[PDB]
Design a protein around this ligand. Structure first.
Ligand SMILES: [Mg+2]
Ligand SMILES: [Mg+2]
Ligand SMILES: [Mg+2]
Ligand SMILES: [Mg+2]
Ligand SMILES: [Mg+2]
Ligand SMILES: [Mg+2]
Ligand SMILES: [Mg+2]
Ligand SMILES: [Mg+2]
Ligand SMILES: [Mg+2]
Ligand SMILES: [Mg+2]
Ligand SMILES: [Mg+2]
Ligand SMILES: [Mg+2]
Ligand SMILES: [Mg+2]
Ligand SMILES: [Mg+2]
Ligand SMILES: [Mg+2]
Ligand SMILES: [Mg+2]
Ligand SMILES: [Mg+2]
Ligand SMILES: [Mg+2]
Ligand SMILES: [Mg+2]
Ligand SMILES: [Mg+2]
Length: 289
């Protein structure tokens, strides 16, 4: 019933994902995108410095998928990462790892391109991973790599998934990830940012993520989160801490879109309630000692 050998080619892999997907109550494509992401994370996890410490920490939506699992998180399309060390050293090393491969997967990495960001001295970089399993093209994963900011790579959590184990690839998955305090600080800053009138802030989906991250903090002391918030808000020197969680007029339907698939969770059902929930969380953070 559980496969004893790894899949022999792509068709058998896709075929096994679909069977796991239906068996688990999940949409096939979501499961496949999640496996693609895990595979990319395993390439990133082999990148270490000369002490063995990870060079890349995953953040953003890919990280929330690994923390809460597929049923209890938004679909993540970006593989957001933070590089402890710099520039094309990260790209050349991922092309290296991708050529060597992992349990039959290989990957090619398109060329990096800078992106416009006001509060980042080093402009983050986007490119793409072209995955293949035993030769045959498998999937494509967008990747975003940003540079360290303050202490947001000082520590890391290590997260697992057994999705690959369900299709007969038994190797252990262990992905270094940015800690929750710094994930809260960066989402809080992005959801409250005012952008230049050429573009407008569409990030109502971060009101969902901030409610999920608050849930994951449990009863923990908030001083680490407050220090991370102060650090990121000062580092970036845009709006000051503590921010006001404003909603924009087009956010109601964007927020409703971000809640697809999460009816079973304890979430604000309207973007107003969500903004109120996140503002109380901001006050909670500001009060800690
Ligand atoms: Mg084939
Ligand atoms: Mg299916
Ligand atoms: Mg199966
Ligand atoms: Mg993270
Ligand atoms: Mg994040
Ligand atoms: Mg997510
Ligand atoms: Mg360097
Ligand atoms: Mg590219
Ligand atoms: Mg710091
Ligand atoms: Mg650590
Ligand atoms: Mg494992
Ligand atoms: Mg962010
Ligand atoms: Mg505290
Ligand atoms: Mg502290
Ligand atoms: Mg105001
Ligand atoms: Mg909805
Ligand atoms: Mg609705
Ligand atoms: Mg949406
Ligand atoms: Mg409310
Ligand atoms: Mg609160």
């Amino acid at each position: 019933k559980p496969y004893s050998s790894p899949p022999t080619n792509l068709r058998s892999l896709r075929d096994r994902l679909t069977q796991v997907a239906e068996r688990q109550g999940v949409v096939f494509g979501r499961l496949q995108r999640h496996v693609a992401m895990i595979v990319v994370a395993q390439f990133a996890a082999t990148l270490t410095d000369d002490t063995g410490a990870p060079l890349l920490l995953v953040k953003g939506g890919s990280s929330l998928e690994l923390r809460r699992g597929i049923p209890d998180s938004r679909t993540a399309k970006d593989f957001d990462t933070v590089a402890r060390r710099d520039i094309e050293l990260i790209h050349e090393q991922l092309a290296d790892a991708g050529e060597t491969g992992w349990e039959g997967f290989t990957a090619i990495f398109t060329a990096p391109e800078e992106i416009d960001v006001p509060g980042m001295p080093v402009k983050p970089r986007r490119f793409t991973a072209k995955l293949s399993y035993r030769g045959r093209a498998f999937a494509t994963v967008p990747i975003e790599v940003s540079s360290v900011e303050a202490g947001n790579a000082d520590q890391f959590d290590t997260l697992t998934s057994d999705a690959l184990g369900l299709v007969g690839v038994p190797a252990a998955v262990a992905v270094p990830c940015m800690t929750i305090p710094w994930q809260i600080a960066q989402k809080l800053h992005a959801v409250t940012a005012v952008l230049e009138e050429p573009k407008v802030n569409d990030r109502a989906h971060d009101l969902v993520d901030l409610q999920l991250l608050e849930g994951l903090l449990l009863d923990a002391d908030l001083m680490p989160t407050r220090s991370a918030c102060i650090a990121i808000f000062e580092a970036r020197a845009q709006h000051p801490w503590p921010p006001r969680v404003a909603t924009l007029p087009h956010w109601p339907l964007i927020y409703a879109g971000a809640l697809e698939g999460l009816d079973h969770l304890e979430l604000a059902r309207t973007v107003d309630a969500a903004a109120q929930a996140v503002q109380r969380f901001v006050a909670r953070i500001d009060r800690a000692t």
